[PDB]
């Protein structure tokens, strides 16, 4: 232990005083490498896309093995340094749902992190792509069903436990689907605690250690609430100079962290986190049912 405060723990502390959050999100913005995205905007391509101006790197973009379109609007995010490698996606469309499920089997995926809602602002983000009830969800585009095998509902997240079937293999893979409710489109985690709760759940699962594919981490566009949580649990791993951090990782996806208290956020959590679990949770009040047996 250092008596020391780290080098993040004294930016946070400059940052904060001088105010300087929005002038170092500025910073970032101007900073950040600008890649081809040439597939993104073929025309053929226009359904697949949530959103106009979020697009992957055809550097980064996964690819959809054997499909007459390989197109679909998600990025693997590669931090060799820290061993970590995530998939960050849009909220899944419509028509795009049967390729969400195609890329999860086809990159070994084992955990999908979930971070908006269904409907945000009166808005639609995100298609329902997994089962609500004991019904098989069936994706015929690609060949692929989802049946909801058991839930774990805490207050701010939900844990799905689901079973995808490669429907002409008949292979089955059961996928944790971590889905946090409470966290707003544009904003952020109601504490370091409760974010950090929710990052180490997903942990302890170990869908995020090496021996699977990648993570897939989305939410409406898959860049601010995804581009956060990748931050933070990739900025742990290291333990570092966070901007730097953040400016490599929007090499593989645009747009990483939307807003300067996202990356204020970002700042805090790490703080938190390079530290008490126990703490996190009871602060969390992740429990619907507290009482004692």
Known sequence: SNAMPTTIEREFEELD????????????????????????????????????????????????????????????????????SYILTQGPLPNTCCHFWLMVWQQKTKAVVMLNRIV?????????????????????????????????????????????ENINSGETRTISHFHYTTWPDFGVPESPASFLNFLFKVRESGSLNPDHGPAVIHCSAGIGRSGTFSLVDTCLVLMINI????????????????????????????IEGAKIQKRWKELSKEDLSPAFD
């Open 17 to 84: 005083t001088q105010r300087r959050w929005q002038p170092l999100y500025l910073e970032i913005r101007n900073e950040s490498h600008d890649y081809p995205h040439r597939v993104a905007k073929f025309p053929e391509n226009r359904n697949r896309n949530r959103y106009r101006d979020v697009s992957p790197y055809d550097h980064s973009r996964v690819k959809l093995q054997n499909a007459e379109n390989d197109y679909i609007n998600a990025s693997l995010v590669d931090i060799e340094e820290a061993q970590r």
């Open 120 to 164: 945000e602002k009166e808005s639609v983000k995100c298609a329902q792509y997994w089962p609500t009830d004991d019904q098989e969800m069936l994706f015929k585009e690609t060949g692929f069903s989802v049946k909801l095998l058991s839930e774990d509902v805490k207050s701010y997240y939900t844990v799905h436990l689901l079973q995808l």
């Open 243 to 270: 901007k730097q951090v953040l400016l490599n990782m929007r090499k593989y996806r645009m747009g990483l962290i939307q807003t300067p208290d996202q990356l204020r956020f970002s700042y805090m959590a790490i």
